[PDB]
Write an enzyme that holds these catalytic residues in place. Structure first.
Site, PDB file in Angstrom:
ATOM      1  N   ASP B  43       0.786  -1.078  -0.337  1.00  0.00           N
ATOM      2  CA  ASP B  43       0.062   0.279  -0.158  1.00  0.00           C
ATOM      3  C   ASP B  43       0.822   1.403  -0.209  1.00  0.00           C
ATOM      4  O   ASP B  43       0.736   2.073  -0.626  1.00  0.00           O
ATOM      5  CB  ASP B  43      -0.807   0.259   1.273  1.00  0.00           C
ATOM      6  CG  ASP B  43      -0.361   0.263   2.447  1.00  0.00           C
ATOM      7  OD1 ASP B  43       1.004  -0.288   2.848  1.00  0.00           O
ATOM      8  OD2 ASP B  43      -1.303   0.594   3.288  1.00  0.00           O
ATOM      9  N   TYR B 100       3.082 -11.840  -1.509  1.00  0.00           N
ATOM     10  CA  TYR B 100       1.522 -12.396  -2.198  1.00  0.00           C
ATOM     11  C   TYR B 100       1.653 -12.824  -3.194  1.00  0.00           C
ATOM     12  O   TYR B 100       2.517 -12.260  -4.071  1.00  0.00           O
ATOM     13  CB  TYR B 100       0.472 -11.298  -1.816  1.00  0.00           C
ATOM     14  CG  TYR B 100       0.806  -9.943  -2.321  1.00  0.00           C
ATOM     15  CD1 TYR B 100       0.375 -10.046  -3.672  1.00  0.00           C
ATOM     16  CD2 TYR B 100       1.087  -8.922  -2.518  1.00  0.00           C
ATOM     17  CE1 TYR B 100      -0.834  -8.530  -4.144  1.00  0.00           C
ATOM     18  CE2 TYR B 100       1.058  -7.416  -3.111  1.00  0.00           C
ATOM     19  CZ  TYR B 100       0.555  -7.450  -4.312  1.00  0.00           C
ATOM     20  OH  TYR B 100       0.185  -6.568  -5.003  1.00  0.00           O
ATOM     21  N   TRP B 110       2.210 -14.251   2.794  1.00  0.00           N
ATOM     22  CA  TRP B 110       3.013 -14.447   3.530  1.00  0.00           C
ATOM     23  C   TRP B 110       4.051 -13.106   3.716  1.00  0.00           C
ATOM     24  O   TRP B 110       5.221 -12.909   3.715  1.00  0.00           O
ATOM     25  CB  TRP B 110       3.502 -15.647   3.187  1.00  0.00           C
ATOM     26  CG  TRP B 110       3.401 -16.979   2.609  1.00  0.00           C
ATOM     27  CD1 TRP B 110       3.207 -18.173   3.122  1.00  0.00           C
ATOM     28  CD2 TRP B 110       2.675 -16.922   1.746  1.00  0.00           C
ATOM     29  NE1 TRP B 110       2.810 -18.519   2.246  1.00  0.00           N
ATOM     30  CE2 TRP B 110       2.396 -18.155   1.520  1.00  0.00           C
ATOM     31  CE3 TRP B 110       2.283 -15.806   0.151  1.00  0.00           C
ATOM     32  CZ2 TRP B 110       1.827 -18.652  -0.094  1.00  0.00           C
ATOM     33  CZ3 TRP B 110       2.588 -16.423  -0.554  1.00  0.00           C
ATOM     34  CH2 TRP B 110       1.598 -18.208  -1.147  1.00  0.00           C
ATOM     35  N   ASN B 173      -7.008   2.891   6.146  1.00  0.00           N
ATOM     36  CA  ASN B 173      -6.557   1.642   5.276  1.00  0.00           C
ATOM     37  C   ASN B 173      -7.320   0.261   6.339  1.00  0.00           C
ATOM     38  O   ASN B 173      -5.698  -0.741   6.471  1.00  0.00           O
ATOM     39  CB  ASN B 173      -4.910   1.133   4.734  1.00  0.00           C
ATOM     40  CG  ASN B 173      -4.548   0.172   3.666  1.00  0.00           C
ATOM     41  OD1 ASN B 173      -5.803  -0.338   3.138  1.00  0.00           O
ATOM     42  ND2 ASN B 173      -3.255  -0.543   3.522  1.00  0.00           N
ATOM     43  N   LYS B 233     -12.747   8.918   1.378  1.00  0.00           N
ATOM     44  CA  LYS B 233     -13.548   8.084   0.042  1.00  0.00           C
ATOM     45  C   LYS B 233     -14.274   7.473  -0.340  1.00  0.00           C
ATOM     46  O   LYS B 233     -14.541   6.980   0.840  1.00  0.00           O
ATOM     47  CB  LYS B 233     -12.182   7.196  -0.789  1.00  0.00           C
ATOM     48  CG  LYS B 233     -10.780   8.080  -0.774  1.00  0.00           C
ATOM     49  CD  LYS B 233      -9.621   7.347  -0.972  1.00  0.00           C
ATOM     50  CE  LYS B 233      -9.177   7.017   0.600  1.00  0.00           C
ATOM     51  NZ  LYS B 233      -7.412   6.975   0.605  1.00  0.00           N
ATOM     52  N   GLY B 235     -15.688   4.701  -2.591  1.00  0.00           N
ATOM     53  CA  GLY B 235     -15.847   4.063  -4.284  1.00  0.00           C
ATOM     54  C   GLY B 235     -16.284   4.724  -5.061  1.00  0.00           C
ATOM     55  O   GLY B 235     -15.622   6.029  -5.430  1.00  0.00           O
ATOM     56  N   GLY B 265      -7.391   3.362  -3.116  1.00  0.00           N
ATOM     57  CA  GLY B 265      -6.702   4.073  -2.713  1.00  0.00           C
ATOM     58  C   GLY B 265      -5.361   4.469  -2.183  1.00  0.00           C
ATOM     59  O   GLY B 265      -5.238   5.824  -2.104  1.00  0.00           O
ATOM     60  N   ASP B 266      -4.869   3.854  -2.951  1.00  0.00           N
ATOM     61  CA  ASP B 266      -3.387   3.825  -2.503  1.00  0.00           C
ATOM     62  C   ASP B 266      -2.713   5.538  -3.654  1.00  0.00           C
ATOM     63  O   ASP B 266      -2.182   6.433  -3.181  1.00  0.00           O
ATOM     64  CB  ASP B 266      -2.517   2.958  -3.160  1.00  0.00           C
ATOM     65  CG  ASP B 266      -2.500   1.699  -1.914  1.00  0.00           C
ATOM     66  OD1 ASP B 266      -2.862   1.996  -0.924  1.00  0.00           O
ATOM     67  OD2 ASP B 266      -2.206   0.670  -2.164  1.00  0.00           O
TER      68      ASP B 266
HETATM   69  N1  ADP Z   1     -16.112   2.091  -9.208  1.00  0.00           N
HETATM   70  C1  ADP Z   1     -15.003   3.182  -9.000  1.00  0.00           C
HETATM   71  N2  ADP Z   1     -15.775   4.063 -10.400  1.00  0.00           N
HETATM   72  C2  ADP Z   1     -14.553   5.376 -10.553  1.00  0.00           C
HETATM   73  N3  ADP Z   1     -13.609   5.549  -9.354  1.00  0.00           N
HETATM   74  C3  ADP Z   1     -13.032   4.869  -8.455  1.00  0.00           C
HETATM   75  C4  ADP Z   1     -14.137   3.665  -8.143  1.00  0.00           C
HETATM   76  N4  ADP Z   1     -13.897   3.221  -7.172  1.00  0.00           N
HETATM   77  C5  ADP Z   1     -12.786   3.897  -6.114  1.00  0.00           C
HETATM   78  N5  ADP Z   1     -12.713   4.705  -7.940  1.00  0.00           N
HETATM   79  C6  ADP Z   1     -11.495   6.272  -6.826  1.00  0.00           C
HETATM   80  O1  ADP Z   1     -10.328   5.641  -6.199  1.00  0.00           O
HETATM   81  C7  ADP Z   1     -10.305   6.354  -4.805  1.00  0.00           C
HETATM   82  C8  ADP Z   1     -10.612   5.570  -4.236  1.00  0.00           C
HETATM   83  O2  ADP Z   1     -11.751   4.699  -3.864  1.00  0.00           O
HETATM   84  P1  ADP Z   1     -11.478   2.750  -2.580  1.00  0.00           P
HETATM   85  O3  ADP Z   1     -12.788   2.547  -2.993  1.00  0.00           O
HETATM   86  O4  ADP Z   1     -11.033   3.777  -1.524  1.00  0.00           O
HETATM   87  O5  ADP Z   1     -10.323   2.590  -2.848  1.00  0.00           O
HETATM   88  P2  ADP Z   1      -9.747   0.877  -2.347  1.00  0.00           P
HETATM   89  O6  ADP Z   1     -10.231   0.018  -3.478  1.00  0.00           O
HETATM   90  O7  ADP Z   1      -8.532   1.238  -2.595  1.00  0.00           O
HETATM   91  O8  ADP Z   1      -9.933   0.990  -1.047  1.00  0.00           O
HETATM   92  C9  ADP Z   1     -12.144   7.168  -4.644  1.00  0.00           C
HETATM   93  O9  ADP Z   1     -12.213   8.045  -4.347  1.00  0.00           O
HETATM   94  C10 ADP Z   1     -12.413   6.997  -6.172  1.00  0.00           C
HETATM   95  O10 ADP Z   1     -11.557   7.987  -6.850  1.00  0.00           O
END
Ligand code: ADP
Ligand code: ADP
Ligand code: CL
Ligand code: CL
Lengths: 306, 306
Positions: B43, B100, B110, B173, B233, B235, B265-266
């Site tokens: 990460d 991994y 691991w 995270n 964040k 999604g 997210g990274d």
């Molecule tokens: N389904 C998606 N469609 C468009 N952008 C996305 C989507 N999922 C994540 N992102 C982008 O990545 C960023 C991090 O989302 P997050 O789900 O928290 O990351 P992770 O999947 O690594 O946990 C979001 O703010 C968004 O900008």
């Protein structure tokens, strides 16, 4: 899809060897640089693998524990594809298997949390796996990976099986890194010897950790623990043995083009146990074991086709 | 061969970001079946990797611990090749790195004995790495892998650096499997928040483990721990933020052809921190972060070229 044959109350249609220990996922360099081929190995598994090729009409069983993930299922599929009976495999829900990586050759490994470390968690399952085995084989690695309780459970199961007429075979296979200390290692290895009819130590390892002056001293030490047939491997040198007070020596024919000594001892053990199970005299079995290992050191990797 | 630039007593020629955590060896399926390509991820390392591509004129440093084997040296070479300054890497003699394996996609790992678990063993080395960093970034994984003592050492170093004018950034995270229990996890994550100026939580994870009703509740929780800028964040949904009592929302433009959310997210965190370091307003930085992550989820693997 491995044929287990038939049985009545008194005999089984197949000779039956059980091998107990840890099978490892392994990654070795493939042709395209930066890529590695996934396969499966590990000392006791390797011996089972050579055994299934030496006597494909027999039943070669492997007892261990694996996880429930994709890699564990790949491993289970690999054993079956190798003609190894993995019916006795235990599944540990939250864990995965151990892994080693060969780099280009350097070995790195990850096994501290492997499911195989729980292989002695169920005493009933251990006993059932050994019950009608002609030979039960295990190693010092099998002992190393278990905790105190697991070790006791395994040794009791081995001792009880030995008493019903199972032939118990043991390779000390000393790997200090897998032990908390060398005191614990040497002590526990000799507990393993105390339940074994046949012991297959390698001299240079024994000399380092036990202080053995020569292969005959090694044999004497094992015979002192009640081992009936001690066969001492010693690299390219003659194999000394000791059986019921009788010593002997068997030559090891020179091998040119030694490539990789990986599984030398594991394949020796398989060639030896194969020949003992066929009812051949110990000198003859040792000669056969040396011949197979001689071919194995001429090939790349732990699993060489011979 | 990474350019570190120059410095006087008062300024350095390069903006300087330090990222602290565990880099992992990773194996992912290659084209030939049964083969896997070796690379490096993890990460905080991923964020450093995206940062080095966003601002290749800057100094992007990674602080961690690795072994002294071939795989560890391969990892060190990989960071350098990525333009990441690994000068602060500590070497732990008896250990190797975490690994991994992606199977074909399932992830197995691991890391229980990895050298990176000792990254907070030397308080002086931690302090020296942060001393002239503009931004110090770490994650809840960084906290998870350390023992009690290491966690305290890291948090004290972070708190002291914060007090000298380092900007501290934190991604919770949440990965429960890496913690002894979820009570320990939530508690320790909030200790991390208590030393951070910027926090970058992901809502669905926070909702599961903290019980947050909505993204605003999440922000409030972090702001309560003293976090100045909380960016939540969520999604594909709008990013809510909270900065010095002021709330805001930033849209996330629809992405078609989502392939792999690995490092979403990274990469968001990298795009955000890159833009903050450039002195852009938070709304603008969040928009930039979303744009980069949008491209990243359209590519395969953790390290996507954008
Ligand atoms: N389904 C998606 N469609 C468009 N952008 C996305 C989507 N999922 C994540 N992102 C982008 O990545 C960023 C991090 O989302 P997050 O789900 O928290 O990351 P992770 O999947 O690594 O946990 C979001 O703010 C968004 O900008
Ligand atoms: N250099 C060698 N030349 C020929 N045969 C060998 C050599 N090394 C090992 N072998 C064969 O393999 C057997 C096992 O040897 P050993 O060194 O104990 O195995 P390992 O290398 O697995 O510890 C020997 O008895 C011998 O028959
Ligand atoms: Cl019957
Ligand atoms: Cl100066």
């Amino acid at each position: 899809g491995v044929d287990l044959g038939t049985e009545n109350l008194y005999f089984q249609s197949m000779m039956h060897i059980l091998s107990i220990g840890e099978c490892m996922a392994e990654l070795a360099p493939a042709d395209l640089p930066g890529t590695y081929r996934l396969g499966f190995a590990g000392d006791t598994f390797n011996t089972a693998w050579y055994l299934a090729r030496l006597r494909p009409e027999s039943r070669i069983s492997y007892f261990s524990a694996i996880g429930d993930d994709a890699l564990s299922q790949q491993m289970r599929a690999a054993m079956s594809a190798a003609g190894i009976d993995g019916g006795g495999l235990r599944v540990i829900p939250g864990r995965t298997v151990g892994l080693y990586l060969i780099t280009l050759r350097s070995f790195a490994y990850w096994r501290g949390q492997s499911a195989a470390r729980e292989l002695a968690g169920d005493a009933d399952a251990l006993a059932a796996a050994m019950a009608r085995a002609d030979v039960v084989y295990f190693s010092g690695i099998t002992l190393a990976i278990l905790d105190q309780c697991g070790r006791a459970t395994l040794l009791r199961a081995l001792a009880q099986a030995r008493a019903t007429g199972r032939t118990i075979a043991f390779d000390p296979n000393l790997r200090p890194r897998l032990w908390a200390g060398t005191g614990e290692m040497t002590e526990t290895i000799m507990q393993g010897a105390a339940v074994s009819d046949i012991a297959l130590p390698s001299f240079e390892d024994e000399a380092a950790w036990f202080g053995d002056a020569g292969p005959d001293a090694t044999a004497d030490r094992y015979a002192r623990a009640g081992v009936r047939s001690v066969v001492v491997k010693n690299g390219p040198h003659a194999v000394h043995f000791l059986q019921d007070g009788r010593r002997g020596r068997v030559p090891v024919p020179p091998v040119a083009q030694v490539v990789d000594t990986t599984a030398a001892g594991d394949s020796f053990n398989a060639g030896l146990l194969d020949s003992v199970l066929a009812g051949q005299p110990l000198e003859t079995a040792i000669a056969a074991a040396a011949a197979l290992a001689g071919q194995v050191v001429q090939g790349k990797g732990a699993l060489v086709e011979v």
